[PDB]
Scaffold this active site. Structure first.
Site, PDB file in Angstrom:
ATOM      1  N   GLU A  98      -8.368  -4.333  -5.106  1.00  0.00           N
ATOM      2  CA  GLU A  98      -7.070  -3.843  -5.368  1.00  0.00           C
ATOM      3  C   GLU A  98      -6.231  -4.680  -5.377  1.00  0.00           C
ATOM      4  O   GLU A  98      -5.308  -5.034  -6.548  1.00  0.00           O
ATOM      5  CB  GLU A  98      -6.673  -2.797  -4.406  1.00  0.00           C
ATOM      6  CG  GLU A  98      -7.361  -1.558  -4.143  1.00  0.00           C
ATOM      7  CD  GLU A  98      -7.058  -0.493  -5.180  1.00  0.00           C
ATOM      8  OE1 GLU A  98      -6.198  -0.643  -5.947  1.00  0.00           O
ATOM      9  OE2 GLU A  98      -7.874   0.339  -5.408  1.00  0.00           O
ATOM     10  N   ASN A 151       1.774   0.240 -13.164  1.00  0.00           N
ATOM     11  CA  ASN A 151       0.726   1.054 -13.813  1.00  0.00           C
ATOM     12  C   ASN A 151       1.399   1.812 -15.048  1.00  0.00           C
ATOM     13  O   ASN A 151       2.658   1.843 -15.347  1.00  0.00           O
ATOM     14  CB  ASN A 151       0.350   2.070 -13.080  1.00  0.00           C
ATOM     15  CG  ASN A 151      -0.456   1.408 -11.744  1.00  0.00           C
ATOM     16  OD1 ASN A 151      -0.050   1.746 -10.333  1.00  0.00           O
ATOM     17  ND2 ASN A 151      -1.430   0.649 -11.903  1.00  0.00           N
ATOM     18  N   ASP A 162       1.560   4.757 -15.767  1.00  0.00           N
ATOM     19  CA  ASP A 162       2.410   5.786 -15.810  1.00  0.00           C
ATOM     20  C   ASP A 162       3.933   5.682 -15.138  1.00  0.00           C
ATOM     21  O   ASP A 162       4.519   6.380 -14.659  1.00  0.00           O
ATOM     22  CB  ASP A 162       1.733   6.913 -14.657  1.00  0.00           C
ATOM     23  CG  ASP A 162       1.725   6.550 -13.104  1.00  0.00           C
ATOM     24  OD1 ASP A 162       2.167   5.458 -13.059  1.00  0.00           O
ATOM     25  OD2 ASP A 162       1.292   7.308 -12.324  1.00  0.00           O
ATOM     26  N   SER A 222       4.625   3.995 -12.599  1.00  0.00           N
ATOM     27  CA  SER A 222       4.560   3.725 -10.964  1.00  0.00           C
ATOM     28  C   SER A 222       4.306   2.333 -10.725  1.00  0.00           C
ATOM     29  O   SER A 222       3.850   1.537 -11.686  1.00  0.00           O
ATOM     30  CB  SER A 222       3.440   4.777 -10.130  1.00  0.00           C
ATOM     31  OG  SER A 222       2.273   4.300 -10.575  1.00  0.00           O
ATOM     32  N   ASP A 254       2.096  -0.234  -7.722  1.00  0.00           N
ATOM     33  CA  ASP A 254       1.400  -0.454  -6.472  1.00  0.00           C
ATOM     34  C   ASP A 254       1.685  -1.525  -5.736  1.00  0.00           C
ATOM     35  O   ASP A 254       2.085  -2.652  -6.358  1.00  0.00           O
ATOM     36  CB  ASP A 254      -0.055  -0.742  -6.896  1.00  0.00           C
ATOM     37  CG  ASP A 254      -0.748   0.456  -7.485  1.00  0.00           C
ATOM     38  OD1 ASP A 254      -0.569   1.633  -7.260  1.00  0.00           O
ATOM     39  OD2 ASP A 254      -1.706   0.233  -8.345  1.00  0.00           O
ATOM     40  N   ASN A 290       0.805   3.302  -3.854  1.00  0.00           N
ATOM     41  CA  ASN A 290       1.328   3.829  -5.003  1.00  0.00           C
ATOM     42  C   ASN A 290       2.585   4.365  -4.761  1.00  0.00           C
ATOM     43  O   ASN A 290       2.858   5.304  -3.901  1.00  0.00           O
ATOM     44  CB  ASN A 290       0.432   4.485  -6.000  1.00  0.00           C
ATOM     45  CG  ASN A 290       0.845   4.910  -7.205  1.00  0.00           C
ATOM     46  OD1 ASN A 290       1.653   5.830  -7.514  1.00  0.00           O
ATOM     47  ND2 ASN A 290       0.821   3.826  -8.120  1.00  0.00           N
ATOM     48  N   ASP A 310      -5.723  12.570   3.849  1.00  0.00           N
ATOM     49  CA  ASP A 310      -5.277  13.696   3.026  1.00  0.00           C
ATOM     50  C   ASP A 310      -6.238  13.855   1.908  1.00  0.00           C
ATOM     51  O   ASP A 310      -6.612  14.970   1.702  1.00  0.00           O
ATOM     52  CB  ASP A 310      -3.989  13.230   2.391  1.00  0.00           C
ATOM     53  CG  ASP A 310      -3.566  14.176   1.169  1.00  0.00           C
ATOM     54  OD1 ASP A 310      -4.007  14.145   0.294  1.00  0.00           O
ATOM     55  OD2 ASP A 310      -2.654  14.779   1.678  1.00  0.00           O
TER      56      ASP A 310
END
Ligand code: CL
EC number: 3.2.1.17
Length: 129
Positions: free
Chosen positions: A35, A46, A48, A50, A52, A59, A101
């Site tokens: 990562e 990223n 999209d 977003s 990280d 994220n 989650d």
């Protein structure tokens, strides 16, 4: 901080990640390697839109508030930039929420594609834990 491999393994163990939600320490060390390259200050945009953040590349779309994101879910209840310290506590605490989650580590794209299913125990070999 840029951690060494066994240095990070020991820190993650002190912060309760060894076997957290069933994920052995090697999983977490492999995740951090791929990562962030063991780098607490790393950030990555990223496709999209977003970003990280930190040692475990948390994220901004779901997990932390980057202060721009309208209607931010911020499920870890933390500013994204607050994940960027050499001390891993905040990132670990958020990782614990993510894996709980998800009933798994699949949210970590690098882990899912480069660690999952491999011999993750190799990442803690020689660390004398
Ligand atoms: Cl350490």
């Amino acid at each position: 901080k840029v951690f060494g491999r066994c240095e990070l393994a020991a820190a993650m163990k002190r912060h309760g990640l060894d076997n957290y939600r069933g994920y052995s320490l090697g999983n977490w060390v492999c995740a951090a390697k791929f990562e962030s390259n063991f780098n607490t200050q790393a950030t990555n945009r990223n496709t999209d839109g977003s970003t990280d953040y930190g040692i475990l590349q948390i994220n901004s779309r779901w997990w932390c508030n980057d202060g721009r994101t309208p209607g931010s879910r911020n499920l870890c209840n933390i500013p994204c930039s607050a994940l960027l310290s050499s001390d891993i506590t905040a990132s670990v605490n958020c990782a614990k929420k993510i894996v709980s989650d998800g009933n798994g580590m699949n949210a970590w794209v690098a882990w899912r594609n480069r660690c999952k299913g491999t011999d993750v125990q190799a990442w803690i070999r020689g660390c004398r834990l």
